[PDB]
Design an enzyme around this catalytic site. Structure first.
Site, PDB file in Angstrom:
ATOM      1  N   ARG A  90      -1.648  -9.572  13.111  1.00 20.67           N
ATOM      2  CA  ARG A  90      -2.053  -8.524  12.164  1.00 20.67           C
ATOM      3  C   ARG A  90      -2.771  -9.102  10.959  1.00 20.67           C
ATOM      4  O   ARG A  90      -3.824  -8.615  10.560  1.00 20.67           O
ATOM      5  CB  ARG A  90      -0.843  -7.730  11.691  1.00 20.67           C
ATOM      6  CG  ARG A  90      -0.327  -6.794  12.731  1.00 20.67           C
ATOM      7  CD  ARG A  90       1.057  -6.296  12.395  1.00 20.67           C
ATOM      8  NE  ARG A  90       1.057  -5.382  11.257  1.00 20.67           N
ATOM      9  CZ  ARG A  90       2.159  -4.993  10.619  1.00 20.67           C
ATOM     10  NH1 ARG A  90       3.349  -5.445  11.007  1.00 20.67           N
ATOM     11  NH2 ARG A  90       2.066  -4.140   9.612  1.00 20.67           N
TER      12      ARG A  90
ATOM     13  N   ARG B  15      11.197  -6.503   6.308  1.00 20.22           N
ATOM     14  CA  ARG B  15      11.236  -5.055   6.083  1.00 20.22           C
ATOM     15  C   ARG B  15      12.165  -4.380   7.099  1.00 20.22           C
ATOM     16  O   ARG B  15      12.160  -4.746   8.279  1.00 20.22           O
ATOM     17  CB  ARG B  15       9.839  -4.436   6.224  1.00 20.22           C
ATOM     18  CG  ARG B  15       9.869  -2.906   6.375  1.00 20.22           C
ATOM     19  CD  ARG B  15       8.523  -2.289   6.092  1.00 20.22           C
ATOM     20  NE  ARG B  15       7.529  -2.652   7.101  1.00 20.22           N
ATOM     21  CZ  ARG B  15       6.245  -2.330   7.037  1.00 20.22           C
ATOM     22  NH1 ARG B  15       5.780  -1.636   5.994  1.00 20.22           N
ATOM     23  NH2 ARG B  15       5.433  -2.649   8.042  1.00 20.22           N
TER      24      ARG B  15
ATOM     25  N   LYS C 228       0.797  -1.231   0.000  1.00 20.13           N
ATOM     26  CA  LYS C 228       0.000   0.000   0.000  1.00 20.13           C
ATOM     27  C   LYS C 228       0.833   1.287   0.000  1.00 20.13           C
ATOM     28  O   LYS C 228       0.655   2.148  -0.865  1.00 20.13           O
ATOM     29  CB  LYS C 228      -0.995  -0.001   1.186  1.00 20.13           C
ATOM     30  CG  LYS C 228      -2.057  -1.101   1.113  1.00 20.13           C
ATOM     31  CD  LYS C 228      -3.154  -0.969   2.189  1.00 20.13           C
ATOM     32  CE  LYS C 228      -2.600  -1.159   3.607  1.00 20.13           C
ATOM     33  NZ  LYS C 228      -2.011  -2.507   3.743  1.00 20.13           N
TER      34      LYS C 228
ATOM     35  N   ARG D 218      10.528  -2.366  12.344  1.00 17.57           N
ATOM     36  CA  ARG D 218       9.365  -1.759  12.979  1.00 17.57           C
ATOM     37  C   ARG D 218       8.925  -2.700  14.123  1.00 17.57           C
ATOM     38  O   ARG D 218       9.078  -3.929  14.028  1.00 17.57           O
ATOM     39  CB  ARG D 218       8.245  -1.578  11.939  1.00 17.57           C
ATOM     40  CG  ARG D 218       7.493  -0.251  12.033  1.00 17.57           C
ATOM     41  CD  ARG D 218       6.564  -0.004  10.837  1.00 17.57           C
ATOM     42  NE  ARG D 218       5.252  -0.636  10.977  1.00 17.57           N
ATOM     43  CZ  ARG D 218       4.240  -0.475  10.122  1.00 17.57           C
ATOM     44  NH1 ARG D 218       4.384   0.295   9.051  1.00 17.57           N
ATOM     45  NH2 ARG D 218       3.074  -1.069  10.343  1.00 17.57           N
TER      46      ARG D 218
ATOM     47  N   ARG E  11     -10.975  -0.128   6.878  1.00 15.83           N
ATOM     48  CA  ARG E  11     -10.558  -1.515   7.025  1.00 15.83           C
ATOM     49  C   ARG E  11     -11.542  -2.401   7.791  1.00 15.83           C
ATOM     50  O   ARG E  11     -11.264  -3.555   8.130  1.00 15.83           O
ATOM     51  CB  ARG E  11      -9.082  -1.684   7.396  1.00 15.83           C
ATOM     52  CG  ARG E  11      -8.654  -1.301   8.731  1.00 15.83           C
ATOM     53  CD  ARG E  11      -7.178  -1.716   8.857  1.00 15.83           C
ATOM     54  NE  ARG E  11      -6.219  -0.800   8.229  1.00 15.83           N
ATOM     55  CZ  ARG E  11      -4.910  -1.037   8.138  1.00 15.83           C
ATOM     56  NH1 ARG E  11      -4.394  -2.170   8.608  1.00 15.83           N
ATOM     57  NH2 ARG E  11      -4.093  -0.088   7.704  1.00 15.83           N
TER      58      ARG E  11
HETATM   59  N1  AP5 Z   1       5.942  -5.535  -5.259  1.00 11.78           N
HETATM   60  C1  AP5 Z   1       6.764  -5.756  -4.223  1.00 11.78           C
HETATM   61  N2  AP5 Z   1       7.644  -6.783  -4.270  1.00 11.78           N
HETATM   62  C2  AP5 Z   1       8.507  -7.047  -3.273  1.00 11.78           C
HETATM   63  N3  AP5 Z   1       8.531  -6.307  -2.177  1.00 11.78           N
HETATM   64  C3  AP5 Z   1       7.634  -5.300  -2.008  1.00 11.78           C
HETATM   65  C4  AP5 Z   1       6.768  -5.000  -3.028  1.00 11.78           C
HETATM   66  N4  AP5 Z   1       5.966  -3.987  -2.705  1.00 11.78           N
HETATM   67  C5  AP5 Z   1       6.348  -3.634  -1.464  1.00 11.78           C
HETATM   68  N5  AP5 Z   1       7.360  -4.413  -1.046  1.00 11.78           N
HETATM   69  C6  AP5 Z   1       8.066  -4.452   0.254  1.00 11.78           C
HETATM   70  O1  AP5 Z   1       7.199  -5.099   1.207  1.00 11.78           O
HETATM   71  C7  AP5 Z   1       7.233  -4.354   2.427  1.00 11.78           C
HETATM   72  C8  AP5 Z   1       5.871  -3.781   2.752  1.00 11.78           C
HETATM   73  O2  AP5 Z   1       5.465  -2.837   1.752  1.00 11.78           O
HETATM   74  P1  AP5 Z   1       4.712  -1.496   2.160  1.00 11.78           P
HETATM   75  O3  AP5 Z   1       4.371  -0.664   1.002  1.00 11.78           O
HETATM   76  O4  AP5 Z   1       5.561  -0.905   3.182  1.00 11.78           O
HETATM   77  O5  AP5 Z   1       3.345  -2.151   2.658  1.00 11.78           O
HETATM   78  P2  AP5 Z   1       1.997  -1.812   3.433  1.00 11.78           P
HETATM   79  O6  AP5 Z   1       0.883  -2.482   2.735  1.00 11.78           O
HETATM   80  O7  AP5 Z   1       1.933  -0.351   3.291  1.00 11.78           O
HETATM   81  O8  AP5 Z   1       2.398  -2.366   4.791  1.00 11.78           O
HETATM   82  P3  AP5 Z   1       1.936  -1.935   6.174  1.00 11.78           P
HETATM   83  O9  AP5 Z   1       2.772  -2.591   7.180  1.00 11.78           O
HETATM   84  O10 AP5 Z   1       2.231  -0.501   6.350  1.00 11.78           O
HETATM   85  O11 AP5 Z   1       0.478  -2.251   6.292  1.00 11.78           O
HETATM   86  P4  AP5 Z   1      -0.470  -2.031   7.466  1.00 11.78           P
HETATM   87  O12 AP5 Z   1      -1.821  -1.787   6.924  1.00 11.78           O
HETATM   88  O13 AP5 Z   1      -0.484  -3.316   8.195  1.00 11.78           O
HETATM   89  O14 AP5 Z   1       0.027  -1.012   8.482  1.00 11.78           O
HETATM   90  P5  AP5 Z   1      -0.275   0.456   8.692  1.00 11.78           P
HETATM   91  O15 AP5 Z   1       0.928   1.266   9.012  1.00 11.78           O
HETATM   92  O16 AP5 Z   1      -1.275   1.036   7.773  1.00 11.78           O
HETATM   93  O17 AP5 Z   1      -1.156   0.438  10.089  1.00 11.78           O
HETATM   94  C9  AP5 Z   1      -0.501   0.094  11.334  1.00 11.78           C
HETATM   95  C10 AP5 Z   1      -1.496  -0.081  12.480  1.00 11.78           C
HETATM   96  O18 AP5 Z   1      -2.280   1.114  12.732  1.00 11.78           O
HETATM   97  C11 AP5 Z   1      -3.622   0.724  13.040  1.00 11.78           C
HETATM   98  N6  AP5 Z   1      -4.516   1.133  11.946  1.00 11.78           N
HETATM   99  C12 AP5 Z   1      -4.216   1.678  10.749  1.00 11.78           C
HETATM  100  N7  AP5 Z   1      -5.345   1.891  10.059  1.00 11.78           N
HETATM  101  C13 AP5 Z   1      -6.336   1.487  10.860  1.00 11.78           C
HETATM  102  C14 AP5 Z   1      -7.694   1.525  10.597  1.00 11.78           C
HETATM  103  N8  AP5 Z   1      -8.165   1.993   9.423  1.00 11.78           N
HETATM  104  N9  AP5 Z   1      -8.482   1.046  11.567  1.00 11.78           N
HETATM  105  C15 AP5 Z   1      -8.022   0.558  12.718  1.00 11.78           C
HETATM  106  N10 AP5 Z   1      -6.710   0.526  12.970  1.00 11.78           N
HETATM  107  C16 AP5 Z   1      -5.836   1.001  12.048  1.00 11.78           C
HETATM  108  C17 AP5 Z   1      -3.559  -0.788  13.250  1.00 11.78           C
HETATM  109  O19 AP5 Z   1      -3.029  -1.041  14.571  1.00 11.78           O
HETATM  110  C18 AP5 Z   1      -2.495  -1.175  12.240  1.00 11.78           C
HETATM  111  O20 AP5 Z   1      -1.944  -2.435  12.557  1.00 11.78           O
HETATM  112  C19 AP5 Z   1       8.333  -3.320   2.285  1.00 11.78           C
HETATM  113  O21 AP5 Z   1       9.566  -3.846   2.813  1.00 11.78           O
HETATM  114  C20 AP5 Z   1       8.450  -3.102   0.787  1.00 11.78           C
HETATM  115  O22 AP5 Z   1       9.819  -2.801   0.435  1.00 11.78           O
HETATM  116 MN    MN Z   2       1.858   1.295   4.953  1.00 16.37          MN
END
Ligand code: AP5
Ligand code: MN
Ligand code: ZN
Length: 217
Positions: free
Chosen positions: A171, A127, A13, A160, A88
């Protein structure tokens, strides 16, 4: 252009959001990033969100919806926006519908980046992020020139807090239960578009850019 990027943890994402906003010049709204910012500032919401984020649980709906509502009412969202990680849950999605209606907007696409769970596990545990500049690397898929050193600033790379295997399994489980029913919710509305996220980064972006192109047509 009003878009939603939807995907299980590690789907790519943030990686894609950065490429999208760089091409269109619209704001990137990430709930995860907003929570992290609040944690650093030491705000009441940041202190509450920390407990859930540390365990890999979702922050409650009421609180999450509230911060998104406040963010979307700003003038910088007039030309469109990209929501990353929100909604989500079904409750968050229903709320988003009326939140957008109140400001005279409707979603264009809900881009669902689909990736198998086993691959997601690896995406997250390998990561590494720069402590200095925030640059992201991946020990398996995209490593730094030198181990534990950021190529851009020379900073220290670290994992992280929520990216350790045990927290990642929680997760994936909670997001699978809460987010997956959204595929059906948006398919019914006609906003849903599926993208194969198990491709190289540029190809995933090309597929997305191809889809977005239909908006100009
Ligand atoms: N094509 C490819 N091929 C190979 N490698 C690749 C690739 N594309 C990418 N990569 C690699 O893969 C890795 C990941 O890619 P990356 O782009 O970093 O992935 P992501 O989908 O953005 O990963 P997140 O960890 O950020 O997702 P998330 O939704 O769990 O966490 P978030 O911070 O939003 O949320 C964190 C927390 O906040 C809370 N939260 C956030 N939103 C909500 C909500 N809406 N409601 C309730 N709680 C929420 C929850 O506690 C949640 O757990 C990287 O190393 C990258 O280099
Ligand atoms: Mn993210
Ligand atoms: Zn760096």
């Amino acid at each position: 252009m009003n878009l939603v990027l939807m995907g299980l943890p590690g789907a790519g994402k943030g990686t894609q959001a950065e490429k999208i906003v760089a091409a269109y010049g619209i704001p990137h709204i990430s709930t995860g990033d907003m929570f992290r910012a609040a944690m650093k500032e030491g705000t009441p919401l940041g202190l509450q969100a920390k407990q859930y984020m540390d365990r890999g649980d979702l922050v409650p709906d009421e609180v999450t919806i509230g911060i998104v509502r406040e963010r979307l009412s700003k003038d910088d969202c007039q030309n469109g926006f990209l929501l990353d990680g929100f909604p989500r849950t079904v409750a968050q999605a229903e709320a988003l519908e009326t939140m957008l209606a109140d400001i005279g907007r409707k979603l264009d696409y809900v881009i669902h980046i689909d990736v198998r769970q086993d691959v997601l596990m690896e995406r997250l545990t390998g990561r590494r992020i720069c402590r200095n500049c925030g640059a992201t690397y991946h020990l398996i898929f995209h490593p730094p020139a030198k181990p534990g050193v950021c190529d851009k600033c020379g900073g220290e790379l670290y994992q992280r807090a929520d990216d350790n295997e045990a927290t990642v399994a929680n997760r994936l489980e909670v997001n699978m239960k809460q987010m997956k029913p959204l595929v059906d919710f948006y398919e019914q509305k006609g906003y849903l578009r599926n993208i194969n996220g198990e491709q190289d980064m540029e190809k995933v972006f090309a597929d997305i850019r191809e889809l977005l192109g239909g908006l100009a047509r």
